[PDB]
Amino acid sequence: HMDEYMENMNTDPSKAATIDPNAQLTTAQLQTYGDLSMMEIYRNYHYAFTQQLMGCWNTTNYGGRHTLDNNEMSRIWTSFYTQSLKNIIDAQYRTAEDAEKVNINSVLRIYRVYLMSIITDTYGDAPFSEAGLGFLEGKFNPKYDKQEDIYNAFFLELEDAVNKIDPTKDKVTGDLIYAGDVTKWQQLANSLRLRFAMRISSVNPTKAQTEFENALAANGGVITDASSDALIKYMTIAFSFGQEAYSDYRGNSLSQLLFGNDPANNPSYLCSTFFNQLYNSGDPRTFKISRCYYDGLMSATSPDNRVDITQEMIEKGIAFSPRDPGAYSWEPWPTGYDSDICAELAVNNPSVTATMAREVEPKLANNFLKSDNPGVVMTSAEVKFLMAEATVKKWNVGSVSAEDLYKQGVRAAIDFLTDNYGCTATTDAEFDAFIQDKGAFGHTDNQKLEAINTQAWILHFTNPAECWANVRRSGYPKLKSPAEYGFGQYLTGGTEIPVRLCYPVLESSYNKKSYNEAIERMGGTDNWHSLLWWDTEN
């Protein structure tokens, strides 16, 4: 089926919805979190590997118990190379060096870098420079570019893009991140430069510092307040898991999937690592991100009519039972209680029970289960954390103290929930009480890097690609294998939490030489325990 492979991996004008560059951008943006098939990878792997969710069958089975599954691992590769990245490549190619299309071209180059970053931060070496060119240039069988070289190209592409943007030129018309404000595109591009500079800070400290400092000084500057956060706009659409929903990117499919195809039996239960970080630190977001719900009246298609038992649990002294890494909602079975709230519901309703069991395991709050939840690309809060870490590393990034940058990042991360998810606001007094106690910055460099990156991990909950990248890069939080929680007997894929995903096996058939050459650079095996180039330690 080389024919289908070739058709699917290159933009075919005769079959493609459109080759208009502005339209290509719109559809690529929506795909990022709108592709319901692709989002399975995050529920299956990332959210377990970062120990944020655990207990849903899918999360625990795949990532929580290290089940290697080449088809499940393939989703980012397939989805991006056969749709958004290929289409962005086609659009970029057609607008390159056209003086009348410098803004759309520059924006395409920025978003091309962003999508490619997700691919390389998942798999390592991957097609980039030669990708998507079969119909444009007759160039098939693209080489897998080395990750080091991909990162070099990120910095160069982003720099050139910010230098070519000119608000006097072409209008960017279907842009669901910034409604064509190309100044905000410059801010995003320079912020991505910060992200990628910090990413390479362990493997190449000299280059990291230089790129970080270059980005701060670059045309348009960086994202310095939340109004320039890069968030893809999604519409409210009913959640459907019928066959036609898999081609509908209008709604946030990550939110759909975290609600679930089986929402009553397999909701998004929180992992103990994350719930306990929040709860034990008195984090104001504990019960903004999570609640305990009884779902006996909840429909199969939306998180309406759930019964919030969180406050009753607290009043009655019932312990929350978040899921350790490796645990299912049913294993170990939690200690429950008889609910007064649910007993009232049970009056003259045989559907309902008053006896809570798995309802004592914290669940993702309804605010994060909406079709119109944003698609998070990058935030001002993250920029603050990157600046804080650069400052601890003694880079030359301005006059603000590392501690103040850190505190600004935490405040922004908390406010992000208020502004974008309808969560209850956090007051100055609440913020100060937290930052003065368990949210404090710390005294030693290691304490400070731990605080920064732990706070980043919480911020990246809604951005699982970046969450997993930053956990691997920074080493924080320090996570233990499911083996350390009692689940070692089940870890078929090996004891250690995976640090990358393997290449799709069909690459062996359809791009064999390139595939074999990439695998040879890792020593000749394709192993999800192999560290990526930027990832210097497990």
Q: Which residues bind Mg ion (CB under 5 A)?
A: 472, 523-524, 535, 537
Amino acid identity for residue 24 in this structure = Q
* Residue 242 vs 523, nearer CB to Mg ion: 523
Query: What DSSP line would sit under 514-538, residue for residue?
Result: HHHHHHHHTTS---TTSPPTT----
As measured in angstroms, the least distance from the Cβ of 533 to Mg ion is 11
* Residue 146 vs 164, nearer CB to Mg ion: 146
* Residue 350 vs 524, nearer CB to Mg ion: 524
CB-based contact 250:234 (threshold 8 Å): yes
As measured in angstroms, the least distance from the Cβ of 490 to Mg ion is 24
* Residue 110 vs 518, nearer CB to Mg ion: 518
As measured in angstroms, the least distance from the Cβ of 475 to Mg ion is 5
* Residue 199 vs 306, nearer CB to Mg ion: 199
As measured in angstroms, the least distance from the Cβ of 322 to Mg ion is 24
Integer Cα distance of 288 and 459 in angstroms: 13
CB-based contact 360:238 (threshold 8 Å): no
* Residue 350 vs 523, nearer CB to Mg ion: 523
Q: 50: part of which helix (H) or strand (E)?
A: none
As measured in angstroms, the least distance from the Cβ of 478 to Mg ion is 10
Integer Cα distance of 374 and 485 in angstroms: 34
As measured in angstroms, the least distance from the Cβ of 479 to Mg ion is 10
Integer Cα distance of 173 and 536 in angstroms: 41
As measured in angstroms, the least distance from the Cβ of 471 to Mg ion is 8
* Residue 22 vs 474, nearer CB to Mg ion: 474
* Residue 171 vs 521, nearer CB to Mg ion: 521
CB-based contact 183:166 (threshold 8 Å): no
Q: 478: part of which helix (H) or strand (E)?
A: none
As measured in angstroms, the least distance from the Cβ of 472 to Mg ion is 4
* Residue 43 vs 472, nearer CB to Mg ion: 472
As measured in angstroms, the least distance from the Cβ of 469 to Mg ion is 10
Integer Cα distance of 373 and 218 in angstroms: 31
**CB-based closest residue to Mg ion:** 524
CA distances from 226 to 194, 381, 411 (A): 16, 8, 11
* Residue 315 vs 537, nearer CB to Mg ion: 537
As measured in angstroms, the least distance from the Cβ of 535 to Mg ion is 4
The CA-based angle 212-213-218, given to 5 degrees, is 100
* Residue 395 vs 534, nearer CB to Mg ion: 534
* Residue 90 vs 535, nearer CB to Mg ion: 535
- Provide the token pair at 133: 């060119």
Neighbours of 297 (CB within 10 A): 14
Dihedral of CA atoms 113, 119, 123, 125 in degrees, nearest 10, equals -40
Integer Cα distance of 57 and 366 in angstroms: 20
Amino acid identity for residue 197 in this structure = A
Long-range contacts of 191-194 (CB under 8 A, 24+ apart): 191/215, 191/222, 191/223, 191/230, 191/378, 191/382, 191/383, 192/110, 192/113, 192/114, 192/117, 192/154, 192/158, 192/378, 193/154, 193/155, 193/158, 193/159, 193/218, 194/222, 194/383, 194/386, 194/387, 194/390
As measured in angstroms, the least distance from the Cβ of 43 to Mg ion is 23
As measured in angstroms, the least distance from the Cβ of 518 to Mg ion is 12
Q: Which residues of 165-188 are buried (b: 16+ CB within 10 A; e: fewer)?
A: beeebbebebbbbbebebebbbbb
- Provide the token pair at 458: 């919480």
Sign (positive or negative) of CA dihedral 48, 461, 291, 268:
negative
Which residues share a beta bridge with 364?
A: 290
